């Protein structure tokens with residue numbers, strides 16, 4: 287169709303973008319903006335050239351690369367505008383003025399940021415309509431329910447988000463700035479103990495791949511450490527781009543163990559199991575049962591084999607003895623936020639909730655608070 | 660048109676009762692099929708309290724701020740949805756459990772915007 291709604295899910299690491307009604311995002315690309323080196327501060331020099339996503343990475347040798355979203359929050363608005371322009375014109379190949387656009391945000395996103403997104407979409411991109419939803423709310427909806435507690439963990443941030451009828455519950459949301467990029471950095475560190483030397487940005491990307499391919503969450507960490515010490519059964523080979531092969535052992539499970547033991551990287555936070563429990567306890571006593579029964583995992587950092595079973599074990603140990611507990615870990619969960627957006631934007635009853643250009647013209651940027659909740 | 664007319668005409672579809680409450684707690688008008696504790700209701704709004712009780716039914720507050728109140732009885736007895744009329748009064752509506760509090764809020768906020776001009 288000429289005017290199909292768009293769905294853009296902006297993450298700290300990856301942009302997921304596509305068309306409402308599609309089963310998967312058409313475009314998944316790095317949330318990076320590259321600008322010519324040494325031209326950020328130079329006499330009489332403007333900011334005319336820039337590159338986004340995979341093209342920025344291809345030209346890394348002549349560009350300085352930045353992430354416009356930090357821990358799920360937009361912090362560089364000029365570069366964020368470039369991400370959005372690139373999404374519309376280069377990735378989706380649409381005229382934004384012809385398509386309603388659904389976007390996503392972190393829970394507790396500040397008012398100024400919500401208004402600024404809205405302003406940019408209407409005043410800069412001239413979209414006919416816009417909506418923004420909380421990422422965890424979309425993931426929950428993608429799983430076929432509107433009540434549950436989401437563990438949302440990506441590249442930059444992890445949240446525990448308890449939700450009832452699609453509302454993220456007052457006072458109960460937890461943010462932890464420990465996610466996939468930190469786990470990659472930690473894996474680089476602990477591989478040094480084995481006699482490897484992963485240090486550079488290019489080497490970081492190799493370790494990200496090692497992490498994604500070979501890491502898993504141990505069901506019992508101390509038992510798994512004993513198994514790794516006594517035998518080579520858990521060891522795996524990994525072929526580097528140049529053809530050289532290395533061996534990874536207990537680092538496979540020590541890396542994502544950090545989610546459950548943040549002290550591994552010197553963080554004082556309790557682990558994701560305990561913050562799930564703490565979040566549930568900040569909710570209405572009469573809602574808690576339904577949260578325990580509907581733990582939904584979303585985001586790339588929830589992809590580790592064993593994580594669902596580990597969470598089931600750990601939450602069971604914290605919860606009341608007879609509590610019915612269920613972890614739902616959809617196979618699609620690296621894209622479930624986006625998928626939730628696609629389903630919602632296509633829904634007949636949703637259409638009344640689009641912010642229209644006329645509504646923006648009458649009410650201004652705070653229209654987002656009237657309609658997006 | 661009148662206060663009674665604006666608040667009364669909201670009673671259609673999923674919306675079953677309404678009340679217009681000054682920031683003092685004084686009830687200017689409410690539909691005759693219920694009786695709200697105006698001081699209690701306005702304090703839940705002002706202080707962002709975790710529940711609102713109307714006629715022995717506890718509604719758990721799931722969204723509350725300067726412009727909006729959404730509360731739901733977890734046992735399935737319905738919702739209370741509030742919007743604010745130009746910082747002068749809180750307009751609340753009872754919404755049937757099967758009704759969507761989001762679309763009810765849109766209608767209640769629209770009426771609150773109209774009420775602001777006659778308060």
Ligand SMILES: Nc1ncnc2c1ncn2[C@@H]1O[C@H](COP(=O)(O)OP(=O)(O)OP(=O)(O)O)[C@@H](O)[C@H]1O
Nearest residue numbers: 297298299300440441442443466498585586587589
């Ligand atoms: N199979 C996997 N196992 C472990 N980690 C993975 C896997 N696949 C992807 N990841 C990690 O998930 C992260 C990307 O996930 P995602 O797209 O959900 O994050 P994001 O939305 O960019 O970030 P955030 O939600 O933190 O703002 C990266 O750190 C990536 O290495």
Ligand SMILES: C/C1=C/C(=O)O[C@@H]2C[C@@H](CC[C@H](C)/C=C\CC1)O[C@@](O)([C@@H]1CSC(=O)N1)C2
Nearest residue numbers: 419423427432451452635636639659759761762
């Ligand atoms: C933020 C959000 C949450 C949600 O879970 O949305 C879903 C889908 C939504 C569609 C209509 C609504 C008016 C539009 C958008 C709200 C979307 O209906 C719901 O609000 C209602 C409440 S519980 C239910 O089953 N449907 C839930």
Ligand SMILES: C/C1=C/C(=O)O[C@@H]2C[C@@H](CC[C@H](C)/C=C\CC1)O[C@@](O)([C@@H]1CSC(=O)N1)C2
Nearest residue numbers: 299300316317318343441466467470490491494
């Ligand atoms: C395939 C892929 C995965 C990813 O998650 O990419 C995102 C975005 C990416 C941007 C820089 C990188 C050099 C470019 C592209 C890699 C994109 O940074 C990440 O790799 C960062 C750095 S290491 C890590 O774990 N996260 C995450």
Ligand SMILES: [Ca+2]
Nearest residue numbers: 296297421440
């Ligand atoms: Ca994300």
